[PDB]
């Protein structure tokens, strides 16, 4: 065995923690390091459903806390009336009215349907790629049939003489 090379080139400005070039993959790793891994719960019921009475207390505590702190809550309610009416009457059709009136506006639905089909393709990735290889394995085995014929030529020549 020949002695291989000691090492290839080592870039002086590229590291695994500080990659030189940018992509969403490295941002994805730094993102999941930040939010941390999936917080797996070992319990048999969720935290919210087991503490509905207690969460109701603190929920109303902070409502009263804000209510006791906000002496002028009626001024905030009245100052919010006009924008509440305005933005809801203006955006009603584009949010909800389109579903039973003049136009459907199915742009957002088309993107869900495309993703649902892509989700299904990824679910059958193993089956689809395995069917593609079976055709390539069929072609590869068809080429290997020639070496099997030549190996027996010596036996044919021996018995022919």
């Amino acid at each position: 065995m020949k002695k291989p090379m000691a090492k290839a080139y080592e870039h002086p400005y590229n590291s695994e923690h500080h990659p030189l070039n940018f992509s969403a993959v490295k941002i994805a790793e730094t993102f999941h390091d930040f939010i941390g891994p999936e917080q797996v719960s070992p319990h048999y019921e969720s935290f919210a459903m087991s503490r509905k009475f207690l969460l109701t207390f603190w929920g109303g505590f902070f409502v009263l806390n804000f209510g006791m702190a906000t002496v002028d809550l009626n001024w905030i309610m009245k100052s919010t009336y006009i924008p509440w009416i305005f933005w809801f009457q203006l955006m009603y059709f584009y949010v909800e009215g389109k579903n039973s009136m003049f136009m459907p506006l199915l742009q957002r639905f088309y993107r869900r349907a495309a993703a649902n089909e892509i989700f299904t393709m990824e679910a059958f990735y193993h089956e689809n790629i395995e069917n593609k290889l079976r055709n390539l394995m069929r072609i590869t085995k068809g080429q290997l049939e020639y070496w099997d014929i030549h190996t027996s030529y010596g036996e044919i020549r021996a018995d022919s003489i």
């Binding site: 790793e29 999941h32 891994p37 999936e38 797996v40 719960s41 070992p42 319990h43 048999y44 019921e45 969720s46 790629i129 593609k132 290889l133 390539l136 080429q143 020639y146 014929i149 030549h150 030529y153 020549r157 022919s160």
Partner: protein, 105 residues
Amino acid sequence: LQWGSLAERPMVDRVMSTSTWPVPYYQRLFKAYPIREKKDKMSLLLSDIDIDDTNWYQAKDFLRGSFRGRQIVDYVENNIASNTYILIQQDVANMAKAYVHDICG
């Protein structure tokens, strides 16, 4: 070095676990990936690529590791009239005619 029993499978395949009541409600969303290391595993991109130049190039690399393989490589690259190293057999013309020239004796 020890190899164990060829008839048996790894113990990971034989170990099992069963459930009971109560059962954890939590449904796993993703597989954990705490350390980004996937060494000694080949890329899954190398899946259904057709035959190409990398096949005869890597063949010579592995053949040249043996004595008989070194003879095949040197003979093919020198004494075979082919316009490509991507050898495809679609006929037995060169095979049959090479046999009739040898079986006469």
